[PDB]
Amino acid sequence: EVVKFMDVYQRSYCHPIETLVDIFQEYPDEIEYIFKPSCVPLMRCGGCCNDEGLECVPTEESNITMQIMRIKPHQGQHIGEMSFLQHNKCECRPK
């Protein structure tokens, strides 16, 4: 089955899509911890603008807090609540 241009185009176009983000990138400060999971599912702007001059960026945001497990080297491990950034609205704009 071939995917029709229209579908491919609308489906690929810049919009908030669930992205699996690595917790270290979000919190590159707690390098003394080992998280579980290491990455989380976040709504993020993604897709193409189909014009090198444009870039898909967030025009509306919000936070989400999840239960992440942090393991401290050799000395126990606790379930910490982490807040992560999510993209509610994306828009193609000039870079």
Partner: protein, 94 residues
């Protein structure tokens, strides 16, 4: 029958444009009183205001000084006899 002169419903038809310059969406109709709407994908409706965006049943939509907000898949819609029609265009800058 069809209200639009040339109808591109499956593959949009390209329209090379230039930021700041005029851009014309070629969706001309077979009669002056046919009402046509201009929609930008994902979800936006372009409202002719008589200035920057102008309607002309014989040309189509005329945008003077096309901004980024018009680079993309634009669709013209007209409902004639309870039936909805639409032609799509894809503006390609440069």
């Amino acid at each position: 029958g069809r209200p639009f002169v040339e109808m591109y419903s499956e593959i949009p038809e390209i329209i090379h444009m230039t930021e700041g310059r005029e851009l014309v969406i070629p969706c001309r109709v077979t009669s002056p009183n046919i009402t046509v709407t201009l929609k930008k994908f994902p979800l936006d409706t372009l409202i002719p205001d008589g200035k920057r965006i102008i309607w002309d049943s014989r040309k189509g939509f005329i945008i003077s000084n096309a901004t980024y907000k018009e680079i993309g898949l634009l669709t013209c819609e007209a409902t004639v006899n309870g039936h909805l029609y639409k032609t799509n265009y894809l503006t390609h800058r440069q």
